[PDB]
Amino acid sequence: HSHGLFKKLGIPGPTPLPFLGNILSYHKGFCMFDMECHKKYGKVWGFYDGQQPVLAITDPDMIKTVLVKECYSVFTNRRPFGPVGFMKSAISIAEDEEWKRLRSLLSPTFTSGKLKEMVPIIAQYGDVLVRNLRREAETGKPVTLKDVFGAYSMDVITSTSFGVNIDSLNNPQDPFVENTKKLPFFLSITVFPFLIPILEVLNICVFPREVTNFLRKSVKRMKEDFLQLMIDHKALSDLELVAQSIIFIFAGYETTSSVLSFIMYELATHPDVQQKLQEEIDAVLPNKAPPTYDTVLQMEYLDMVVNETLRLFPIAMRLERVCKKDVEINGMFIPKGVVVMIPSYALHRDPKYWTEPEKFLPERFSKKNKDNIDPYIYTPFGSGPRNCIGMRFALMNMKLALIRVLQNFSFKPCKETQIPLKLSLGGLLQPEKPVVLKVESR
């Protein structure tokens, strides 16, 4: 029974229930649970995911110790979760020297240079995006952003990772769109993690095996974008190749479509921001010119908008590292096996660092005020050697979509639209109700 651990270390925290730990307190969302705990306990506090002790830390210096300085030595790995199957080879799930190998093997794939060659191809789908939107916009009818954005981000990730060029909203039949489209239980495997090994020997996997096979076969026909870069330490393997691609599609799809939805909601409810953004796009790109790599990096306000949205909606919600060994960081003892958690969502809406945390104010990120922003408070992409390897790609992909979408259209709230936007209470950062706006042509 490890439920005495925090009270044995003098660390405050909500009293756990037996077996359950604190998970019942997730009933309002664990983001709301983190903020509440931050408010009532201060800088450090402990709670239990079933029998798993989790130490929340909010000190910026502690966060850097954990994310940067002591990462290879102590805090290398995320929380084991599963059942996972062959996806244990995925970089985001791999541990210690295996993760190190995959990070070293995958780093050159996510440089500025490979992104600059990807901008022309991902631009092709900005243009389909505008057409499908123009259609759903000419309907005069409120549009579901997650359906045109979910089609776009889909369209992008497949061609950048396998070169397959499809319009998911209009060729909804290509087996590659089919397979890729397919991708309550979480609640249970946190209070019953002793059951993960059972699901593992039963071939049970949270990733649909029905699909996975399709991919490993699609890789072999390509064996003679992301796939080539990997095909072209010790070298990667065939099945390893597939696990990494699967992680990329998940990352490319649900993050991008969700964030874009969040962006457009903020732009619709702040018309002045939307206009100012469009004026910047129109000045850098006269007469609806084609977005390019070098152009995107000149749009400061566009950058300020994405950053402030990511402040309000950091889709990772929490960063986590498992403590591999007894250690004493910044003046407190962390025992082996505790999960150290950085509550980014709560840190991004903390009044200690943010005046009016709940308002959407891109100027917090202006060249004037950006300097006052602590990189271990504001961590939408994490930090240290295990940060979001696709951060530059994600921002380019979102920005290229935003540019082309705003060059052609404006976004107003509908009688439908949920204002204020509410967040889903699940385990993913997404709107409760889908975002829908009036889209007018410029």
Please list, in sequence order, all residues whose beta carbon lies within 8 angstroms of the beta carbon of residue 234, skipping any fewer than 6 positions away: 101
Query: Does residue 343 bind ligand HEM (CB under 6 A)?
Result: no
Please report whether residue 30 would count as binding ligand HEM according to CB under 6 A.
no
Query: What is the nearest approach in angstroms of ligand HEM to the Cβ of residue 316?
Result: 3
User: Which stretch in 154-162, 190-198, 244-252, 422-430 sits in contact with a second copy by CB under 8 A?
Assistant: 190-198
Stretch that binds a second copy, among 90-98, 116-124, 302-310, 342-350 (CB under 8 A): 90-98
390 contributes a contact to ligand HEM by CB under 6 A: yes
In angstroms, the CA 160 to CA 155 distance is 9
Question: Contacting ligand HEM (CB under 6 A), which of 386, 399, 404, 438?
Answer: 386
If the CB atoms of residues 84 and 401 are measured against a second copy, the closer one turns out to be: 84
Tell which one of 144, 330, 387, 418 touches ligand HEM (CB under 6 A): 387
Distance in angstroms (rounded) separating the CA atoms of residues 32 and 22:
13
To a second copy, the closest distance from the beta carbon of 76 in angstroms equals 13
Q: Is position 414 annotated in a ligand binding site?
A: no
Pick what 5 binds: a second copy, ligand HEM, none; C-beta below 5 to 8 Å, kind-dependent. none
Among 103, 114, 131, 392, binds ligand HEM (CB under 6 A): 103
* Non-local CB neighbours of 423 within 8 Å, separated by 6+ positions: 29, 31, 429, 430, 431, 432
C-alpha 304/C-alpha 388 separation (Å) is 19
What binding mask, one character per residue, do residues 277-316 give for ligand HEM by CB under 6 A, x or -? ---------------------------------x----xx
Q: Whose Cβ is closer to ligand HEM: residue 51's or residue 52's?
A: 52
The 3-class secondary structure across 44-79, one letter per residue, is EEEEEECCEEEEEECCHHHHHHHHHHCCCCCCCECC
CB of 208: closest distance to a second copy in angstroms?
Answer: 18
- Residue 278 CB contacts under 8 Å (≥ 6 apart), including other chains: 406, 407, 410, 442
Residue 97 binds which of a second copy, ligand HEM, none (CB < 5-8 A, kind-dependent): a second copy
SS3 17: strand
| Nearest distance from C-beta of residue 222 to a second copy, angstroms | 24
User: Cis ω on the peptide bond leading into residue 83 (within 30° of 0)?
Assistant: yes
Structure tokens at 268: 């619709």
Angle at 37 between CA 36 and CA 39, to 5 degrees: 65
Q: Return the bridge partners of 21, or none.
A: 17, 49
User: Based on C-alpha coordinates, what's the Rg of the chain?
Assistant: 22
Exposure string (b/e) for 141-180, b if CB count within 10 Å is 16 or more? ebbbbbbbbbbbbbbbbbbbbbebebbbbeeeeeebbebb
DSSP 251: I
**97 or 127: CB nearest a second copy:** 97
Q: Which residues bind a second copy (CB under 8 A)?
A: 19, 51, 96-98, 193-195, 197-198, 200-201, 234, 325-326, 336
Q: Which residues bind ligand HEM (CB under 6 A)?
A: 67, 91-92, 103, 247-248, 251-252, 255, 259, 310, 315-316, 319, 380-383, 386-390, 393-394
- Residues of each annotated binding site: 388
- Residues of each annotated binding site for heme: 388
